[PDB]
Amino acid sequence: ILGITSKKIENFSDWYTQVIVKSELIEYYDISGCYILRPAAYYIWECVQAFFNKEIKKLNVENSYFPLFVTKNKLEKIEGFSPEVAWVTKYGDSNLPEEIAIRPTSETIMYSVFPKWIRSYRDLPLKLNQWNTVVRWEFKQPTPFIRTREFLWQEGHTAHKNEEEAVKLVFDILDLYRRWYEEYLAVPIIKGIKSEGEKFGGANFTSTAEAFISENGRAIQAATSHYLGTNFAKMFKIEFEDENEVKQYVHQTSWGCTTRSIGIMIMTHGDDKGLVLPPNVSKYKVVIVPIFYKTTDENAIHSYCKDIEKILKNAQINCVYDDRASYSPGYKFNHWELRGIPIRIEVGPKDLQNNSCVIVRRDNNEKCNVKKESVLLETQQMLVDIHKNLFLKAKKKLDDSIVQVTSFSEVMNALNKKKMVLAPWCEDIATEEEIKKETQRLLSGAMKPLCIPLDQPPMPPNMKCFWSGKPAKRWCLFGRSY
Numbered sequence: 001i002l003g004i005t006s007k008k009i010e011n012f013s014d015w016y017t018q019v020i021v022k023s024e025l026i027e028y029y030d031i032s033g034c035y036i037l038r039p040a041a042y043y044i045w046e047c048v049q050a051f052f053n054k055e056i057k058k059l060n061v062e063n064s065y066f067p068l069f070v071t072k073n074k075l076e077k078i079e080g081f082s083p084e085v086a087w088v089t090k091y092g093d094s095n096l097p098e099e100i101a102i103r104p105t106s107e108t109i110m111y112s113v114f115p116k117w118i119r120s121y122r123d124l125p126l127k128l129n130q131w132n133t134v135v136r137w138e139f140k141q142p143t144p145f146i147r148t149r150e151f152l153w154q155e156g157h158t159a160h161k162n163e164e165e166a167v168k169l170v171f172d173i174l175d176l177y178r179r180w181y182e183e184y185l186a187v188p189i190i191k192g193i194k195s196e197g198e199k200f201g202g203a204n205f206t207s208t209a210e211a212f213i214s215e216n217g218r219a220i221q222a223a224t225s226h227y228l229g230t231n232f233a234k235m236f237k238i239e240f241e242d243e244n245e246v247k248q249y250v251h252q253t254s255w256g257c258t259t260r261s262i263g264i265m266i267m268t269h270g271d272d273k274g275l276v277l278p279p280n281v282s283k284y285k286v287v288i289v290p291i292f293y294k295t296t297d298e299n300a301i302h303s304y305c306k307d308i309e310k311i312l313k314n315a316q317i318n319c320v321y322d323d324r325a326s327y328s329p330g331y332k333f334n335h336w337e338l339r340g341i342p343i344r345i346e347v348g349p350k351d352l353q354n355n356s357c358v359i360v361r362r363d364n365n366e367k368c369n370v371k372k373e374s375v376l377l378e379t380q381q382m383l384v385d386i387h388k389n390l391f392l393k394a395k396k397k398l399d400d401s402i403v404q405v406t407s408f409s410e411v412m413n414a415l416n417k418k419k420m421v422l423a424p425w426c427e428d429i430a431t432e433e434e435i436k437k438e439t440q441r442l443l444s445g446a447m448k449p450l451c452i453p454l455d456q457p458p459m460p461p462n463m464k465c466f467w468s469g470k471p472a473k474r475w476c477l478f479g480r481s482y
């Protein structure tokens with residue numbers, strides 16, 4: 001009912017349920033894989049959505065909105081997906097003439113019109129984005145935020161005269177996804193390129209951002225940015241008149257990130273007292289709680305607290321003053337801790353006498369006293385350090401989850417020990433399923449290749465692939481995955 005009753009290590013999954021619900025982030029729903037986002041949760045989405053929008057306007061990306069529905073034949077104009085499509089069949093009691101499908105992505109919808117908007121080089125680059133929801137009916141069991149059947153996302157689609165233009169933006173968007181996670185969610189991600197076997201069917205290459213849940217040792221795709229080259233341009237006959245009057249195919253990118261990011265954050269920073277929010281995604285930065293008992297204290301406290309509130313708010317630091325008389329101080333402590341509020345300020349008699357108050361960080365529970373005069377400044381610096389600390393703890397933790405090894409058995413040791421592994425690899429696609437099905441022999445417990453990180457350690461000259469025996473091309477991250 002109230003309090004988290006499962007240790008994050010002991011039942012991590014029951015923990016997650018308890019946290020997301022009891023923190024007022026979500027509510028479950030009578031349709032599997034769909035979840036209600038209460039304001040505490042949606043606020044987080046809005047914050048990142050603001051950030052991302054800001055950043056893509058600088059790349060002249062423009063928002064837009066395409067329809068939620070797509071027709072059978074249009075949709076089937078990408079591979080291995082059709083069993084995941086939800087079909088609208090009727091309206092009221094009337095069967096529709098043809099099935100129509102709910103968007104799982106907007107490629108087919110959008111790219112059918114592109115040729116119409118793109119006749120010449122003067123038309124390029126074309127840069128669109130959507131904030132919409134999409135629907136995929138997925139076999140693997142749904143889990144709030146991480147794998148949802150409906151989900152909010154942003155989906156970006158661009159088209160350019162040439163690769164230099166296009167690829168450059170791919171990596172531009174990838175960095176924005178890093179910042180999304182690091183500057184806002186304080187979640188560290190590793191940028192990489194996916195393997196041929198795991199990359200997006202219609203992409204030249206898929207660049208990715210990868211996170212890792214230490215507790216169950218599962219990696220997770222945090223965001224995705226593709227160079228598509230001309231693949232879709234061939235499929236939808238999207239062409240332009242060159243600066244010389246030769247017809248050309250366009251070079252496109254698509255990229256997207258979803259509410260999954262919210263789940264990643266929760267899993268990262270959440271603890272046994274409950275939700276822990278980086279301040280940049282919590283409406284309330286501070287909760288002010290009075291702690292006193294003699295009735296004589298009552299007016300003078302209500303004031304001191306109301307004063308402290310005034311200071312913060314003036315400074316555009318939103319906060320709550322829990323002054324409710326029918327709740328124990330410990331109720332209030334637990335409650336706001338659980339809800340993720342970064343800072344509690346405690347006000348009692350010893351602080352009025354002393355012109356001060358106790359501040360307490362949500363991230364690690366250090367308390368201090370600070371003279372009222374300098375509360376504003378100390379609160380601001382605190383909030384920053386809480387971000388600094390949440391992030392840095394999470395990067396120390398990520399790094400300890402990554403073991404660099406060279407042999408197959410070193411690999412299995414690491415995998416058995418809930419790690420993810422950095423290993424030399426030849427990159428032959430034929431090895432991927434072998435490696436998957438054969439590790440799974442010792443949610444799916446196979447070792448997937450996650451991403452070939454951009455930041456490569458050096459490659460010894462004779463270094464062999466840990467599986468093929470073939471000489472290894474580059475270091476790749478492998479792990480069990482969400």
Ligand SMILES: Nc1ncnc2c1ncn2[C@@H]1O[C@H](COP(=O)(O)OP(=O)(O)NP(=O)(O)O)[C@@H](O)[C@H]1O
Binds near residue numbers: 145
């Ligand atoms: N069911 C889902 N719920 C929430 N987010 C999702 C879901 N499926 C994919 N994503 C995210 O969507 C982004 C874009 O990738 P996309 O190509 O749409 O999905 P995917 O690669 O098919 N799924 P996965 O195997 O789970 O990473 C990725 O960063 C995924 O993390």
Ligand SMILES: O=C(C[C@H]1NCCC[C@@H]1O)Cn1cnc2cc(Br)c(Cl)cc2c1=O
Binds near residue numbers: 078
């Ligand atoms: O959705 C994608 C590719 C990209 N589209 C928008 C930007 C980011 C995103 O990775 C991969 N994908 C994922 N799931 C799908 C599910 C179905 Br059903 C279909 Cl038809 C198609 C797809 C499908 O194409």
Ligand code: NA
Binds near residue numbers: 220
């Ligand atoms: Na994943």
